[PDB]
Design an enzyme around this catalytic site. Structure first.
Site, PDB file in Angstrom:
ATOM      1  N   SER A 144       0.886  -1.216   0.000  1.00 36.71           N
ATOM      2  CA  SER A 144       0.000   0.000   0.000  1.00 36.71           C
ATOM      3  C   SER A 144       0.900   1.236   0.000  1.00 36.71           C
ATOM      4  O   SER A 144       1.674   1.320  -0.961  1.00 36.71           O
ATOM      5  CB  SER A 144      -1.034  -0.111   1.120  1.00 36.71           C
ATOM      6  OG  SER A 144      -2.032   0.972   0.855  1.00 36.71           O
ATOM      7  N   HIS A 231      -7.789  -6.633   1.777  1.00 35.86           N
ATOM      8  CA  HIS A 231      -6.549  -5.998   2.233  1.00 35.86           C
ATOM      9  C   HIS A 231      -5.747  -6.872   3.191  1.00 35.86           C
ATOM     10  O   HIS A 231      -4.550  -6.911   2.999  1.00 35.86           O
ATOM     11  CB  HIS A 231      -6.866  -4.702   3.024  1.00 35.86           C
ATOM     12  CG  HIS A 231      -7.414  -3.660   2.085  1.00 35.86           C
ATOM     13  ND1 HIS A 231      -6.807  -3.382   0.895  1.00 35.86           N
ATOM     14  CD2 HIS A 231      -8.515  -2.862   2.197  1.00 35.86           C
ATOM     15  CE1 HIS A 231      -7.513  -2.426   0.275  1.00 35.86           C
ATOM     16  NE2 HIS A 231      -8.538  -2.116   1.060  1.00 35.86           N
TER      17      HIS A 231
HETATM   18  P1  LIG Z   1      -2.471   1.739   2.129  1.00 36.44           P
HETATM   19  O1  LIG Z   1      -1.304   2.277   2.942  1.00 36.44           O
HETATM   20  O2  LIG Z   1      -3.413   0.807   2.956  1.00 36.44           O
HETATM   21  C1  LIG Z   1      -4.635   0.166   2.470  1.00 36.44           C
HETATM   22  C2  LIG Z   1      -4.617  -1.281   2.938  1.00 36.44           C
HETATM   23  C3  LIG Z   1      -5.766   0.976   3.108  1.00 36.44           C
HETATM   24  O3  LIG Z   1      -3.400   2.886   1.569  1.00 36.44           O
HETATM   25  C4  LIG Z   1      -2.971   4.132   1.076  1.00 36.44           C
HETATM   26  C5  LIG Z   1      -2.548   3.982  -0.356  1.00 36.44           C
HETATM   27  C6  LIG Z   1      -4.254   5.029   1.098  1.00 36.44           C
END
Ligand SMILES: *P(=O)(OC(C)C)OC(C)C
Length: 249
Positions: A144, A231
């Site tokens: 992410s 996720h």
């Molecule tokens: P990522 O660090 O985490 C997702 C699993 C929510 O998200 C950012 C790109 C908004």
């Protein structure tokens, strides 16, 4: 973190602490060293962002499987917190400038270059002391925002050889980063393996072109697909598959 506290028959652990230069972010870094003997050329080593969450998900079945091949040293780069993420700190440390273009969403962003200097010149040299590390087998993983950080580092770093970028498509500046990735000069990124990892589910169109251009430019770039994962399962899949890959699977 708790498997570090409990111990494993397959691996031994230590923890070290570091501070950002601005004094406001505080790192907790776990180093997991295999208890089986390293190959003569040294252990592969994988540096992993969101280290508190990685340590909470690390279990003996994965360590056992890693130990079937060439188990790596695992460096989980986390924060001094009792939660699995430090959401404020990671949004700063893992993101390049581009992530806040044309928005007022920005927790501040844009700390990736200072976090990379911390990681490459302070944390890595310290945790590798005293270990036989195969430097050609040094890898970096993140998910992410951590996946954006890996792309940013594949563009700028000479320190890592393998880059496992998981779910970068979740980031606002994903396309801007891909645009820089495919703009690189021919052959200069040939020693930097790039593994893009996506699940979630287009995105795939972008990745196939990305692979096509990078191959033409002499880069070993691959795609790992984990279809239809949410996720949590994708966080798990991508970090565990990265460890398994760097162990030689
Ligand atoms: P990522 O660090 O985490 C997702 C699993 C929510 O998200 C950012 C790109 C908004």
């Amino acid at each position: 973190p708790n498997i570090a506290d409990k111990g494993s028959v397959f691996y031994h652990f230590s923890a070290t602490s570091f501070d950002s230069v601005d004094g406001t972010r505080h790192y907790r870094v776990w180093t997991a060293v295999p208890n089986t003997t390293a190959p003569a050329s040294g252990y592969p080593i994988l540096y992993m962002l969101d280290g508190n969450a990685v340590m909470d998900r690390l279990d003996d079945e994965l360590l056992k499987q890693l130990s079937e091949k060439t188990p790596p040293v695992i460096v989980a780069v986390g924060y001094q917190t009792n939660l699995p993420f430090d959401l404020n700190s990671r949004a700063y440390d893992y993101t390049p400038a581009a992530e806040s273009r044309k928005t007022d969403l920005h927790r501040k962003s844009g700390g990736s270059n200072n976090f990379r200097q911390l990681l490459e010149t302070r944390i890595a040299p310290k945790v590798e002391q005293g270990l036989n590390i195969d430097r050609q087998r040094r890898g970096l993983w993140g998910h992410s925002y951590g996946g954006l950080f890996v792309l940013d580092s594949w563009l700028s770093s000479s320190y890592f050889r393998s880059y496992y970028s998981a779910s970068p498509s979740l980031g606002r500046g994903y396309d801007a980063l891909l645009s820089r990735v495919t703009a690189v000069e021919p052959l200069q990124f040939c020693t930097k393996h790039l593994a893009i990892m996506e699940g979630s589910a287009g995105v795939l169109s972008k990745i196939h072109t990305t692979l096509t251009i990078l191959k033409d430019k002499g880069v070993n770039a691959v795609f790992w697909d984990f279809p239809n994962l949410g996720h949590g399962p994708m966080f798990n899949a991508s970090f565990r598959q990265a460890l398994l890959d760097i162990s030689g699977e």
